[PDB]
Design a binder for this molecule. Structure first.
Ligand code: MKH
Ligand code: MKH
Ligand code: MKH
Ligand code: MG
Ligand code: MG
Lengths: 125, 125, 125
């Protein structure tokens, strides 16, 4: 099934995936942020998504931002039934401030397949 | 396609999942920990788990603890055959200490589906 | 349901997985690196890989390095069609430098199953 989304404001950008077999859709900041050194920011995308059945959506790092600028992505687990505004929690572990501009790609969204098991307690395994 | 667990001591709390389609089961600390700024702790759950076949268990961040308190989860890959005490490695990148009380939810456990491929070397792909 | 790889230099070490049900294959450094406290390094494996169809390759942390040495892995999303040198972005959040010696295992490679959905914009969910 498809990944669907809707744009919660005009500042949102539709996620894109250039390559057919790329693991994730690019997520774009809907706003300017300045993240000082050793600080975190929630970067809003102003999109809502409806994930396909049988996965969650992992908000995962973009490789170049980590290797060049020491940016990481925190949190990241979007439940299959989440319909709120997707926020990317960015961590700037670098020594200088990191600027996000509206329309910058700042993370990717991977549809990771998972089980939804029932849980059972036993005395010992 | 059940997740089974056992309590290794009476300090453990059975993992829970509120929504049927949340990605993960909440893991609870069995102990109090104080994590100073820019430090790590291994927080013990005092549970052992038996993951379903075809996945590993990812210990992943709770979204709120990351966006509000700059808490991140390190390590996180529990192999399908692991039967030891589940430990959550918490990183506090905040400027203030972070208190874990016994019984606090500190991470979530996601059953992520994976392959177990054989490996082969070639001269060049 | 083969993972295929090729060595790009003679400094590369073939990835290994000791347990049949371990989530990932060990990745080994091709070089010596010294990572200062609160810094990062891109550790080259000098291998290229060809992932099985239906997954991407997560470069994930080794549990012991995170809980003992405060090492974490950045980036980590290797697309199914990536044929370049696999680099591991290591973050040293410890107060002491961390030494990587050529031949050390520095991360694991997990074949995470994923969907590759088409994307559809709707006016609202
Ligand atoms: O990385 C993630 C992980 C989960 N989710 C979905 C849950 C987001 S949230 O439901 O949990 N949420 C939306 C409104 C408030 C809160 C929040 O935006 C937030 C911002 C600031 C302080 C506390 C919470 C948020 C956003 C992104 C990640 C985590 C929390 C994301 O969007 N991104
Ligand atoms: O996040 C993870 C990832 C893997 N595992 C399973 C393997 C845990 S462990 O086998 O690898 N382990 C138990 C004995 C020592 C070690 C440890 O508790 C540890 C604590 C402190 C210093 C060194 C090792 C541990 C626990 C949790 C994560 C990583 C290490 C977890 O529980 N949590
Ligand atoms: O963890 C990852 C995530 C993705 N990839 C594949 C893309 C690697 S890369 O194509 O994107 N790459 C190869 C040459 C330059 C770049 C790089 O080696 C790099 C090193 C130093 C600065 C900037 C980029 C790299 C390697 C690993 C992760 C991120 C960048 C990895 O190997 N490791
Ligand atoms: Mg506006
Ligand atoms: Mg995953």
């Amino acid at each position: 099934m498809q990944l669907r989304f809707a744009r919660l404001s005009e500042h949102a950008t539709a996620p894109t995936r250039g390559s057919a077999r790329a693991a994730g859709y690019d997520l774009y900041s809907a706003y300017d942020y300045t993240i000082p050194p050793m600080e975190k920011a929630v970067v809003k995308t102003d999109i809502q998504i409806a994930l396909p059945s049988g996965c969650y959506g992992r908000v995962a790092p973009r490789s170049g931002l980590a290797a060049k600028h020491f940016i990481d992505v925190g949190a990241g687990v979007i439940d299959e039934d989440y319909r709120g505004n997707v926020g990317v929690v960015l961590f700037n572990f670098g020594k200088e401030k990191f600027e996000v501009k509206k329309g910058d790609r700042i993370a990717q969204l991977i549809c990771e397949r998972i089980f939804y098991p029932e849980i059972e307690e036993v005395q010992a395994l």
